[PDB]
């Protein structure tokens with residue numbers, strides 16, 4: 001999971 | 005396009 | 009000896025979401041309490057262990073309406089349906105419990121994992 | 131303020147390809163000369179300008195069989211259908227001309243672009  |  | 013187009017999967021998902029927003033080729037309505045959600049069975053199956061089981065069933069594969077368990081929160085479902093079609097999860101302090109419970113019911117293991125991690129941190 | 135799961139789109143496409151290999155929820159047969167190819171209309175639309183136009187047509191959206199132009203080569207179509215479901219293109223010296231012509235007909239602009247680049251290099 002990432003910060004888009 | 006890449007070499008997978 | 010194939011070549012690969014890096015952005016292909018993301019572009020496919022973006023176009024499937026555009027079809028969903030315009031209600032094109034949607035073939036099922038998911039009922040969550042009073043709320044109705046139109047979707048593509050194949051996308052639901054690809055994202056969820058529960059929908060995979062439902063639509064591989066020789067009788068249920070032909071249903072145009074699926075009613076979820078009355079304990080399922082429509083907002084939690086809506087956030088998860090959006091994630092299915094975009095890869096983006098709108099996880100907030102006020103919805104995390106409903107999102108995790110809905111992801112556990114829908115059998116969306118990666119969402120359950122991030123919810124457990126975010127709850128543990130707080 | 132969403133979070134994003136990097137592998138989601140690829141995982142969705144992988145599961146749609148698994149459904150295709152097992153002939154699950156396929157809703158159309160594409161006929162190319164003597165050859166028949168089963169697929170999901172939504173995936174075809176998401177990948178191809180031609181299928182997007184066909185299945186948004188109020189009459190053609192309801193057809194279970196689509197016949198392609200007799201000039202279309204079944205092998206070129208097969209390579210492109212595989213690319214739609216995997217992001218991987220089996221481009222070879224012996225098939226590049228048939229693949230480019232089929233991609234131009236199907237309106238798959240990124241495939242046309244790489245074929246033109248590979249032809250120019252040789």
Ligand SMILES: O=C1Cc2cc(Nc3cc(Cl)ncc3Cl)ccc2N1
Pocket residue numbers: 053054055056057058060115116117118145146148149
């Ligand atoms: O967390 C999850 C997400 C998920 C998706 C699917 N859907 C498929 C799985 C296979 Cl092997 N082939 C085809 C499909 Cl559509 C099943 C279980 C789960 N669990």
Ligand SMILES: O=C1Cc2cc(Nc3cc(Cl)ncc3Cl)ccc2N1
Pocket residue numbers: 023024026027175176177178179180182237238239240
């Ligand atoms: O090279 C290409 C690939 C492609 C795909 C699609 N399919 C869509 C486009 C839009 Cl805007 N919304 C939804 C869909 Cl399914 C149309 C044209 C082309 N050209």
Ligand SMILES: [Cl-]
Pocket residue numbers: 055116117118119120
């Ligand atoms: Cl997931």
Ligand SMILES: [Cl-]
Pocket residue numbers: 177238239240241242
């Ligand atoms: Cl393309």
